[model samples]
Target: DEVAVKMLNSGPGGMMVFDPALVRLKPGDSIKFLPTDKGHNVETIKGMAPDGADYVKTTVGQEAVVKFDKEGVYGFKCAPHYMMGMVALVVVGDKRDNLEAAKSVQHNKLTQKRLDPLFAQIQ
Candidate 1:
């Protein structure tokens, strides 16, 4: 099934606290991270890639209409709240195989600040 993540920046707490750890879905399914506030964004963690996979580039306010065509687990978090633990995970396909791999996966605290070190490459 497709996973939908509501943007929480505009929520009462200005945070996305629900299921901040993992999202599950089947192959060909899609996940959308909505934007509640104008300034907040959704970014992917670089280290949680499957099997030492290359770092997935980060993005801010990525549109929520993309399709998930692969089978596996996907991780993400708010760029500003990384250190504070604002995160989410999207699991595609049968969740049993990937559940263990996604446990305790930390948000990418690497760029939790307003000016991520990698922000220069965000274009």
Candidate 2:
């Protein structure tokens, strides 16, 4: 299955958000990042993804697509607006073994603030 995460500057809940904020996917499913708004790029948060899953990086305006073959949690951010709460996460195959570890990875205070709720949804 394929899913798309949209990048937006201001969303219904807040400013600079990855719409849906959280997603759930099956292992190896293709996930696409759509540029619904401008000046954003998608990049996987280092150390917050499944172990051995290569990190992803994409430039602004690029339609970035990735697959998580490994079953686990994956974190992502829109580099330019990350501090403004532009972050998202996905659980692949319901394997959350690294969920805590991924959450433990440090993020800016604001970044961590928004993620807490998303994380709570996981808990």
Candidate 3:
């Protein structure tokens, strides 16, 4: 089934967060990032996406849809609050084909910490 992940304001430490920060989807499934609050946008982390998927950057209040055509792990973050740990993870199908590659990509300290938990979920 397709999934909708809300970009919400009501989250830990009162920061903008992606509800259900970690998700698992099968190949060909799609996920919609719905901006439910202001000043939040979704962007795919470079080198953290599967199969050379094009990067996505959404405008505030605009919705973005990402299709998982290949089976792998993908990382994304809220452009404005990434330093505050506003990040999310998506695993396509059961195999984490790009887990190591995703982890090898550098990220800000705060963003890395936020992603650790999500990685743990799929490990």
Candidate 4:
């Protein structure tokens, strides 16, 4: 399926979040991350992506489209406000082979603040 995920800068300046933070897709399906607001960019979180997945770092206000070729769990975040918990989760092909590894992955305390709750809802 083709899908789009939006990056919204809500609350106040510098505050942001990804609408529909969780996404599910079949292999070969694509998801495009669109910047619905300024000052936002999409980037993959190291150690949080599925093996063989390409790392992405979209420019501010630019869209990033990724095609899922693997069955695994992937995590991403907005580069600037990642500390504020602006993150996302993607599941491909109904497979979560990397779910545990992704959950066990660590980041800074601030970034972890965002990841803690996200991993909880993944099953």
Candidate 5:
């Protein structure tokens, strides 16, 4: 199956962000990141993808599709808006096995703040 995530310049969250910042997917599911506005690209946060999974990134204002085969949490952010709270989390296979490890990876103040609820959605 496939899901769509949007990078927006403005939405309920106010500024740059990936709409519906948290996503849950089954293994094999692919997500298409869409840029609804310019100046945005989806890039995986270092150390946040499942082990063995290659890192991914998209060009500004472009669409990129990624398939998730492994089970774990995947963190994403807009390169230029990371500190401004533009981040998203993808949980695959409904497994939280690496939850603690993911949380321990570290984040900027606002990014960490925004991730609190997303992490809570795990279990």
Candidate 6:
């Protein structure tokens, strides 16, 4: 699922305080945050969010798999893009990506109409 990465409106492009807002995982569950493009480095920071470990010591060009033995929220960021404000959030459930869906009406009425209802369920 494509969550806001800060600088977007509200859909998945707005200046999100965090990225991948709704990630669902469970205990022992693992997930990888891949790079959609270039110029990004995923890293864990202190007091930023709930990451499986105290910090993520990984870089781009590679992948980071976080196994959540606990619950709650995990926050991360792209070190290379920190100046650009690249942040992400993950929620651990017991199923798939755990991402519900996108609901923001991004200049598209027809699609937005079909999404708004489902998006509401995310909350």
Could you give the C-alpha RMSD of every candidate to the true structure, in order shown?
9.0, 1.3, 1.7, 2.6, 1.2, 9.7
Which model is ahead, 1 or 4, in terms of TM-score? 4
lDDT of 1 at 34: 60
Q: In model 2, which range of ten residues has the least summed lDDT?
A: 5-14
Q: Estimate each model's TM-score.
A: 0.58, 0.92, 0.88, 0.85, 0.93, 0.53
TM-score between candidate 4 and the true structure = 0.85
Candidate 4 global CA lDDT score: 0.80
State the lDDT at 103 in candidate 5: 85
Q: Kindly list the per-residue Cα lDDT of model 2 for residues 1-123, writing each as its tens digit.
A: 789888888885588888778888888698788889878888888888888888788999777888778999889888888778788988888777898799899888888988898899888
Candidates 4 and 5, the one with greater lDDT: 5
Best by lDDT: 5
- Tens-digit lDDT track of model 1 for 1-123: 556666565342344532333455666676666654444466666544355333343355554554665555555656666665566556555533443454444334432432232222221
- The parts of candidate 2 lying over 4 Å away from their true place are none
Q: By lDDT, is 2 or 6 better?
A: 2
Cα lDDT of model 3 by residue, 36-79, tens digit: 88778888888888776777888877887878877888888888
- CA lDDT of every candidate: 0.50, 0.85, 0.82, 0.80, 0.85, 0.46
**lDDT of candidate 2 vs native?**
0.85
Off by over 4 Å in 4: 11-14, 108-113
lDDT of 4 by residue, 7-115 (tens): 8977322358887787878899998888788788888888887888889888988887878898888888888888777888888887777888889877778667766
Question: lDDT per residue, candidate 5, 5-46, as tens digits?
Answer: 888988756788788899889999999988788889988898
Better-scoring candidate (lDDT), 1 or 3? 3
Instruction: Tell me the deviation in Å of residue 6 in model 3.
Output: 0.8
User: Mind sharing the TM-score for model 5?
Assistant: 0.93
Please give the RMSD of candidate 6 to the true structure.
Answer: 9.7
Q: Supply the TM-score for candidate 6.
A: 0.53
